[PDB]
């Protein structure tokens, strides 16, 4: 009678409680600094905030009953402790019998794991509250939060294919737009790194949060470019030029991504590097092959930040992109370096 998503969630939490298991407790108590109290405070603070926003209405999101709020929350808490135990148990330092205090005292990890659990529960129930609702409510930076998604997927194998697909989907949302907003911690991380943006080669074969993030960005973009370059023309494996152009804009024009979408710069790279190379070269009807990609939405090419104001993709291309990238584009030529494309 339950949906297979809710049925799966029920069998994951079966026989488990709102609290840390005896095993996890042992792990907590083998730390020089026992995290258990601060973890409980975090869940409690997240729990209050969640219920407050869940209950009170907005113009976008009408409020729901406290009883459901409490039920979603208890499920997420159960999920939280089960997954946390699995994460801690499988951790290298535990295998080697090393004090895990530092790992367990990172607040952003705990907040993110708990938010991700709330997200799983909400998705399972087909909640109207759509990501990134949960992290906006809980005041969680996308740039920090997204790293917990890979952890969750690999630490809970009871997750259905659909669940994993949804978690990967919200990771892509963070990688393509959410983490590039003007208030994103990404810009701060960039700042302490002296505004040096990882090239693609640098993150393939560094290692700070900046590196890991751009690694996932480049991978995501390469997958979308490869698909695009396997649909319309369809392209020469050059497309090493389109990639190189795109990488140029990430590295040497990172501001172009601020409050924008990753596909907007990818498609402009496609267009401009089409035009100059005298191959083929394609009009913005590129969208036909693009719109068939799952992440593609009309807002992506129909509403694009310009300066308020907003405009379509072609307009953004003409007023902003061309001026910034044409010095690079024109060197591929009638009258030379290329970036390695990841496979």
């Amino acid at each position: 009678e339950f949906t297979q998503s809710v049925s799966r969630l029920q069998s994951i939490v079966a026989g488990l409680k709102n609290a840390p298991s005896d095993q996890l407790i042992n792990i907590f108590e083998s730390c020089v600094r026992n995290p258990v109290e601060n973890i409980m405070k975090i869940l409690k603070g997240i729990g209050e905030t969640f219920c407050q926003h869940y209950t009170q209405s907005t113009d976008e999101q009408p409020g729901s009953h406290i009883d459901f709020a409490v039920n979603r929350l208890k499920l997420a808490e159960i999920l939280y402790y089960k997954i946390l135990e699995t994460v801690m148990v499988q951790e290298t330092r535990r295998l080697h019998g090393m004090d895990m205090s530092v790992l367990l005292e990172q607040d952003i990890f705990h907040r993110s794991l708990m938010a991700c659990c709330l997200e799983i529960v909400l998705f399972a129930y087909s909640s109207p509250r759509t990501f990134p609702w949960i992290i906006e409510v809980l005041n969680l930076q996308p740039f920090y939060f997204y790293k917990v998604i890979e952890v969750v997927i690999r630490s809970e194998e009871g997750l259905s294919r659909d669940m994993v697909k949804h978690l990967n989907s919200i990771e892509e949302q963070i990688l393509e737009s959410l983490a590039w907003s003007h208030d994103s911690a990404l810009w701060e991380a960039l700042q302490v790194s002296a505004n040096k943006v990882p090239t693609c080669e640098e993150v393939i074969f560094r290692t700070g949060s900046l590196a890991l993030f751009y690694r996932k960005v480049y991978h995501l973009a390469s997958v979308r470019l490869r698909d695009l370059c396997l649909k319309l023309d369809v392209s020469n494996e050059l497309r090493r030029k389109i990639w190189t152009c795109f990488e140029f804009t990430l590295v040497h024009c990172p501001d172009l991504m601020k409050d924008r979408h990753l596909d907007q710069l990818l498609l402009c790279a496609f267009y401009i590097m089409a035009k100059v190379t005298k191959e083929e070269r394609t009009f913005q009807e590129i969208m036909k092959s693009y719109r068939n990609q799952p992440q593609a939405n009309s807002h992506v090419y129909r509403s694009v930040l310009l300066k308020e104001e907003r405009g379509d993709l072609i307009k953004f291309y003409n007023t902003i992109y061309v001026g910034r990238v044409k010095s690079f584009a024109l060197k591929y030529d009638l009258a030379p370096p290329l970036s390695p494309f990841p496979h």
Partner: peptide, 18 residues
């Protein structure tokens, strides 16, 4: 020569792509 695109998307999806 300019790389500007002379074109528009002000059309609608039904028309633009069928």
């Amino acid at each position: 020569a300019s790389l500007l695109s002379f074109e528009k998307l002000d059309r609608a999806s039904a028309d633009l792509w069928p």
